[PDB]
Each structure stands twice: as C-alpha cells, then as structure tokens.
C-alpha cells in the first residue's frame, strides 16, 4: 500500500473535493498536515467532534487565536460553525487537518503557513 501519510492525505483531499464541494490546494493540505502532526493510525484521535462545545472552544483558543493569531470575536465560533456545517451535519469522521484546512482557507491565513 501506499502508507497512513498519503493515505490520510489523500483522504482528506477526497473530502474536500467531494464532501465540501471544494478544489484542494495540495500544497497548503500538506503544510496543515504536518502541523497536526505525524500520520495517526487511530482515526479517534484524528477527527473533529462537530457537536462537542468544549472541542469547538479549543479549536477557537489553540489554533484560531494561538496558532492563526486572529483576535476574539463572534466571527471566530462564527467560521467554526460554518465550516462545521459545509463539512456536514451527517458526517461522524470530520478530519481535524480538513477543519483547519478550511479554517484557514476561510479566514484568509494561508500565508502563515509559508
């Protein structure tokens, strides 16, 4: 086969295409990977739990506002919860790295990344 990596990357590209109706840009997917973290087996740990408030809080303090560096406001839960649902409401593996990816995207922070 082709390793968890590529695997999960091909994944996520898969969803973004044709879960969030949207034309991936590889090479900031790949720079949004590499700060998740190394290729995880478990698929627990890589998902995203959409109806969890506490998650979403975490998502909002440690990358929209630490790792992005965007400022508190409505706007901020605002674009999780958008994103959340273009992802969609019936979709129980909501990929973190596809989250971010989007956040990013939707926030206009892909520079941060390089």
Request: aromatic share 8%.
């Amino acid at each position: 086969g082709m390793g968890k990596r590529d695997d999960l990357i091909a994944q996520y590209a898969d969803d973004l295409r044709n879960k969030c109706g949207m034309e991936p840009d590889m090479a900031l997917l790949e720079k949004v990977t590499k700060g998740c973290g190394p290729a995880i087996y478990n698929r627990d740990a890589s998902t995203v739990a959409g109806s969890d408030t506490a998650e979403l809080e975490t998502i909002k303090k440690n990358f929209l506002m630490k790792k992005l560096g965007l400022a508190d406001s409505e706007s901020l839960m605002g674009g999780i919860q958008s994103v959340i649902e273009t992802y969609g409401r019936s979709e129980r593996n909501k990929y973190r790295a596809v989250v971010y990816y989007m956040l990013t995207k939707h926030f206009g922070k892909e520079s941060v990344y390089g």
